[PDB]
């Protein structure tokens, strides 16, 4: 890692150009040179580089991978002081949270919503059930009615949990990765709900992101689902459309996984202090998100000054109504497995390959095999294992402490 400058690392959907503006201010103050980058499947990437110290100075991703590198030791602690702090959601600064210690900056909140073509479709469904009645009817327009990426789990997850599929059983304030809601009722409905709008042609398994993309900016279809940063590309494609809440599946809401876009300073950084004041007085600022978010929505931000600006756009409305019915996603190490095994599930009952109940069956067992732990109370004498973490700090507690102490209550810790 080269000292005296700033190299970052960024999705390739998200706003980069804006990025790079950001850290053009940041040259023409310090004379620190800032190079942003988006390489591929970066996420996959900067654990394998930032093992033997190489990589970018900072890395942007949802903090649901956060916690894994953190565990491997990649990520510096940060030290927001706490007027600092104050000026963030205390929402935002929950997701960052890993085994009780501060590992990253949050930028945004992200949360899949139902986007439609008014023109299209003045009234969007309400319920999943509706759409196959509504595709029929649009076919014999030249249309279709609804095309969303199937090749990332991420996106068919809210369909899953809708009426009882979850990634680890959370109670009272703690998650317990030994019960893993992958192959239970609630989740082989919303599959098979999912692989019958394929079956009857409402829906191909093929489709990804760039695909879907293309067919709802280009007055294809009328519905996609994505996130806040698919907003610029309808922008610029002359759709007239709106953002509203995702549809109902058995009368009970979709539960997006919710997303915070994180900043993470690399372990092996010789710049930290340099990352610390392009992130806190620089980005995370006003200007520093607007262009930012220009060149792609960000969501809702958390910072809580430009947020107050964002908050009367309709489609930031219709990202946290989404939001408050799902659900944050955890930050614990073992949360990749779950994404590989749900991944691999969703795409091979899309495909036929295999049924629904073969293919949960499988995403079940092959996580719980990758999901040894051992609570953080300090005055255990011995490592005392368990499988429960508290949602709020990440931290491992042993069944004893879950119950018996009062500290990591389901409020506050
Ligand atoms: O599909 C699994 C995938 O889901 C999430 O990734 C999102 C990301 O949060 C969004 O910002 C956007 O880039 O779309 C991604 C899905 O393609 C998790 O954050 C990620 O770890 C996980 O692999
Ligand atoms: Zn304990
Ligand atoms: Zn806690």
């Not at 005296?4 to 390739?12: E, H, M, P, R, S």
Request: hydrophobic share 40%; charged share 25%; glycine share 8%.
């Amino acid at each position: 890692i080269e000292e005296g400058k700033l190299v970052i690392w960024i999705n390739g959907d998200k706003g980069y150009n804006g990025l790079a503006e950001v850290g053009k201010k940041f040259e023409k103050d310090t004379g620190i040179k800032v190079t942003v980058e988006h390489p591929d499947k970066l996420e996959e990437k900067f654990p394998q580089v930032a093992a033997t110290g190489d990589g970018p100075d900072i890395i942007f991703w949802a903090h649901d991978r956060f916690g894994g590198y953190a565990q491997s030791g990649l990520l510096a602690e940060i030290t927001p002081d706490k007027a600092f702090q104050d000026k963030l959601y205390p929402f935002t600064w929950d997701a960052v949270r890993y085994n009780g210690k501060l590992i990253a900056y949050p930028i945004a909140v992200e949360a899949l919503s139902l986007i439609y073509n008014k023109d299209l479709l003045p009234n969007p469904p309400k319920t999943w059930e509706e759409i196959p009645a509504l595709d029929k009817e649009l076919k014999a327009k030249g249309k279709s009615a609804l095309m969303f990426n199937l090749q990332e789990p991420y996106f068919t997850w809210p369909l899953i949990a809708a009426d009882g599929g979850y990634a680890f059983k959370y109670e009272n304030g703690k998650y317990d990765i030994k019960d893993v809601g992958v192959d239970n009722a609630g989740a082989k409905a919303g599959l098979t709900f999912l692989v019958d709008l394929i079956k009857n042609k409402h829906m191909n398994a093929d489709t990804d992101y760039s695909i879907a993309e293309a067919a709802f900016n280009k007055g294809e279809t009328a519905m996609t689902i994505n996130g806040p940063w698919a907003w610029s590309n309808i922008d610029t494609s002359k759709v007239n459309y709106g953002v509203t809440v995702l549809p109902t599946f058995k009368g009970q809401p979709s539960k997006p996984f919710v997303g915070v876009l994180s900043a993470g300073i690399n372990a092996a950084s010789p710049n930290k202090e340099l990352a610390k004041e392009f992130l806190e007085n620089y980005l995370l600022t006003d200007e520093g998100l607007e262009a930012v978010n220009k060149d792609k929505p960000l969501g809702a931000v958390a910072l809580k000054s430009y947020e107050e600006e964002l908050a009367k756009d309709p489609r930031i409305a219709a990202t946290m109504e989404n939001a408050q019915k799902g659900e944050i996603m955890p930050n614990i190490p073992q949360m990749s497995a779950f994404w590989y095994a749900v991944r691999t599930a969703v795409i091979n009952a899309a495909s036929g390959r295999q049924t629904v109940d073969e293919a949960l069956k499988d995403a079940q067992t092959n996580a719980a095999a990758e999901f040894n732990i051992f609570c953080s109370n300090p005055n255990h004498r011995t490592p005392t294992l368990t499988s429960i973490y508290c949602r709020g700090c990440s931290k491992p507690l042993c069944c004893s402490c879950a119950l018996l102490d009062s500290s990591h209550s389901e409020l506050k810790c």
